[PDB]
Amino acid sequence: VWEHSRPIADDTIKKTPSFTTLPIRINKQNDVADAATRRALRDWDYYLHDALISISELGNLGAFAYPEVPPERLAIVTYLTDLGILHDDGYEAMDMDQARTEHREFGALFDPHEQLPSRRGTRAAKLKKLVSQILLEAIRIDRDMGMYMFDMYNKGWLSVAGGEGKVPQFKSVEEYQAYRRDDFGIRAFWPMVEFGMAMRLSDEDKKLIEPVMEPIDKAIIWTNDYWSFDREYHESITNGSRLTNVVEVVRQIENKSIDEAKAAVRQLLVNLEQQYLERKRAIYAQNPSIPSHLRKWIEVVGITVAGTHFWASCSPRHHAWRN
Amino acid sequence: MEVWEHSRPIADDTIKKTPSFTTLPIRINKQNDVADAATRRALRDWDYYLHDGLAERALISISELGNLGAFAYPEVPPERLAIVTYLTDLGILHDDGYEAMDMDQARTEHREFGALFDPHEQLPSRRGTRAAKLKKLVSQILLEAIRIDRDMGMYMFDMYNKGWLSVAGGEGKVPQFKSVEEYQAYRRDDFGIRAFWPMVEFGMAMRLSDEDKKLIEPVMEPIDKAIIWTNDYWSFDREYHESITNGSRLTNVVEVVRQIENKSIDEAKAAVRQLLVNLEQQYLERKRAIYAQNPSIPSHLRKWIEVVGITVAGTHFWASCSPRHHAW
Numbered sequence: 258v259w260e261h262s263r264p265i266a267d268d269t270i271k272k273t274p275s276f277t278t279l280p281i282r283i284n285k286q287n288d289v290a291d292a293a294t295r296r297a298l299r300d301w302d303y304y305l306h307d308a309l310i311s312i313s314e315l316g317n318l319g320a321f322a323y324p325e326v327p328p329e330r331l332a333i334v335t336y337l338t339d340l341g342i343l344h345d346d347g348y349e350a351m352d353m354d355q356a357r358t359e360h361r362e363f364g365a366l367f368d369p370h371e372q373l374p375s376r377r378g379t380r381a382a383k384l385k386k387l388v389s390q391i392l393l394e395a396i397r398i399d400r401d402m403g404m405y406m407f408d409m410y411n412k413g414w415l416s417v418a419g420g421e422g423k424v425p426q427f428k429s430v431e432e433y434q435a436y437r438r439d440d441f442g443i444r445a446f447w448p449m450v451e452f453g454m455a456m457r458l459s460d461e462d463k464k465l466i467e468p469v470m471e472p473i474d475k476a477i478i479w480t481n482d483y484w485s486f487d488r489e490y491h492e493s494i495t496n497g498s499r500l501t502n503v504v505e506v507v508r509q510i511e512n513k514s515i516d517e518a519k520a521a522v523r524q525l526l527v528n529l530e531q532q533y534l535e536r537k538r539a540i541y542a543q544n545p546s547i548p549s550h551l552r553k554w555i556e557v558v559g560i561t562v563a564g565t566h567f568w569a570s571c572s573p574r575h576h577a578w579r580n
Numbered sequence: 581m582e583v584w585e586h587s588r589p590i591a592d593d594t595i596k597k598t599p600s601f602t603t604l605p606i607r608i609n610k611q612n613d614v615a616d617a618a619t620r621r622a623l624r625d626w627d628y629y630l631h632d633g634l635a636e637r638a639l640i641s642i643s644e645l646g647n648l649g650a651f652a653y654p655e656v657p658p659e660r661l662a663i664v665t666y667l668t669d670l671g672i673l674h675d676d677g678y679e680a681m682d683m684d685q686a687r688t689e690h691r692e693f694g695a696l697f698d699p700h701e702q703l704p705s706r707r708g709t710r711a712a713k714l715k716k717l718v719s720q721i722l723l724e725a726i727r728i729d730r731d732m733g734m735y736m737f738d739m740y741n742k743g744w745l746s747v748a749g750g751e752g753k754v755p756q757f758k759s760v761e762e763y764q765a766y767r768r769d770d771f772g773i774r775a776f777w778p779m780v781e782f783g784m785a786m787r788l789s790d791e792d793k794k795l796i797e798p799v800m801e802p803i804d805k806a807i808i809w810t811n812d813y814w815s816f817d818r819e820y821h822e823s824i825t826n827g828s829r830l831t832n833v834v835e836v837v838r839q840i841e842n843k844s845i846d847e848a849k850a851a852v853r854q855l856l857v858n859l860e861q862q863y864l865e866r867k868r869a870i871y872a873q874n875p876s877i878p879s880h881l882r883k884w885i886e887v888v889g890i891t892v893a894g895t896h897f898w899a900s901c902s903p904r905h906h907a908w
């Protein structure tokens with residue numbers, strides 16, 4: 258099932274505060290991911306002229322989020338991830354109305370199909386060439402999957418994140434998670450993995466893997482929340498950037514200190530990882546002839562949680578705010 | 581704080597003499613005889629309505645531990661208790677018929693019954709024997725609730741339809757649940773949770789404002805899962821049998837866990853028991869937070885927050901020995 262990734266040794270993992278229980282692997286082409294991050298940084302500055310994104314001491318976020326992706330596709334998905342981070346950081350700092358407008362106008366640039374002329378502010382107008390250029394690169398590698406991925410970057414993320422009204426006050430984990438799925442862009446992320454692995458999941462495929470994706474989606478999102486809480490909380494105080502984080506929700510609705518809320522979220526995460534293993538075991542026990550691409554998918558999502566956990570445990574993006 | 585008025589605590593030895601495992605304290609409405617009389621009234625009316633039914637042998641709220649309505653409505657005065665107990669028993673009897681019907685005809689029967697309770701008078705049935713039977717079945721309870729509280733009775737009946745009868749069962753293909761999330765969205769409709777709390781509001785003569793609902797959302801999150809999954813835990817054996825022997829749908833979180841985690845029945849039940857005890861502790865933590873954050877919380881909202889916890893415990897306790905679940 259493994260082709261493009263290599264395992265991180267226990268001896269390396271123990272040097273970090275990682276606590277994931279799932280297997281940690283990294284794309285073998287980490288240098289390609291780093292080059293893609295440098296390209297995104299250069300292009301952002303070239304087109305906008307105005308950061309702590311995927312690069313870290315442990316390796317590039319793209320090499321951990323896309324472990325089983327060949328290098329030409331890794332360069333695309335890493336670049337799109339970094340472009341998304343750079344955009345999202347600005348979005349979190351803007352007034353809700355203007356933040357929403359920037360999200361929607363940015364998302365319209367990713368539509369792979371012809372659109373009638375529309376008005377767009379300076380920021381989206383300056384990024385239009387950037388987005389069309391990367392779409393052409395993706396299409397040249399894989400037309401149908403490239404167009405699908407770009408369509409979902411909008412439909413799964415930019416068109417929905419932020420909701421449509423005032424900034425909500427989260428009074429339940431259920432309501433938090435509905436908002437956070439949109440805000441995290443989870444419905445854009447899995448299509449990027451599909452593009453990276455050159456497999457389009459069928460509707461029937463998605464139905465079969467739903468029991469695995471249930472704990473996986475919560476785990477991947479709440480793993481970011483766990484590791485990014487300190488920096489998000491600091492930023493919210495220091496400049497008003499919006500704090501969207503399950504640790505914060507637990508702090509509030511359970512009257513818990515930061516450390517008590519973190520301890521609770523850690524237990525949720527480890528339990529979700531073990532639940533994923535049980536849901537996955539059940540799929541194997543009940544599908545003796547599972548197609549190879551679906552076997553690959555259900556295995557890859559587990560290492561994707563593990564790898565993004567591992568990266569987040571040390572990344573400058575989450576930890577450089579206080580040395 | 582002393583918030584109890586119409587209920588009394590159940591004795592520790594009585595509790596230990598049952599398979600109950602709720603971690604929350606157990607109380608019962610002091611007017612159990614009123615609840616039992618309401619159940620018998622529902623059985624009589626349903627028997628007049630239904631050809632060839634179980635009549636007086638249907639297994640609904642009456643038990644040796646007490647009446648389900650006395651446990652589900654512990655803080656309700658006797659006049660209102662008779663109303664909500666009757667409507668709950670009628671709902672159970674109707675739902676048992678629904679569960680035994682093919683899916684689409686069951687849905688149709690679910691919408692038609694809900695229309696009887698719609699204050700907006702939509703979906704009128706065509707006149708005839710069927711319509712006359714349904715009109716007779718519900719006529720007295722419709723008058724009685726309005727005569728005791730017009731404002732809250734109209735609201736309660738509107739939600740008996742809108743929360744439950746109008747939505748339970750969905751439409752189209754019967755689902756094959758592949759996640760607890762998907763299950764719970766369907767189960768909230770099928771259980772009628774959005775009809776149940778309005779009945780409690782009617783019983784306690786208190787309408788929760790929109791503000792009130794936002795404030796208690798952190799408490800209602802674990803409470804709603806607990807009340808529904810508590811029924812699922814205790815009713816699995818009957819529902820599993822009915823699905824196998826008679827082809828009824830199986831709508832039960834124990835079954836979802838059993839399937840999607842490839843567990844034995846006993847392992848699936850144990851997993852759900854752990855979910856339940858954890859939800860009860862979570863309710864306590866959420867409730868403590870509300871009190872810490874709202875020193876001036878209104879008395880009616882404190883009562884509501886405490887009542888929902890005893891409602892989970894009491895319906896758990898009843899279900900641990902209830903004949904419906906154990907001698908069906």
Ligand SMILES: CC[N+](CC)(CC)Cc1ccccc1
Pocket residue numbers: 337338341342345414440441442443445446449
């Ligand atoms: C908003 C999410 N993200 C990182 C996942 C910024 C933090 C960009 C992104 C969005 C959607 C898919 C992939 C990356």
Ligand SMILES: CC[N+](CC)(CC)Cc1ccccc1
Pocket residue numbers: 668671672675740744770771772775776779
């Ligand atoms: C919906 C079926 N029920 C739910 C408790 C028995 C499980 C009766 C009922 C119907 C409508 C409102 C409240 C209860």
Ligand SMILES: [Mg+2]
Pocket residue numbers: 345349440
């Ligand atoms: Mg964000």
Ligand SMILES: [Mg+2]
Pocket residue numbers: 345346349
């Ligand atoms: Mg952010």
Ligand SMILES: [Mg+2]
Pocket residue numbers: 481482485486489
């Ligand atoms: Mg974050």
Ligand SMILES: [Mg+2]
Pocket residue numbers: 675679770
């Ligand atoms: Mg039912």
Ligand SMILES: [Mg+2]
Pocket residue numbers: 675676679
């Ligand atoms: Mg039933």
Ligand SMILES: [Mg+2]
Pocket residue numbers: 811812815816819
């Ligand atoms: Mg049941």
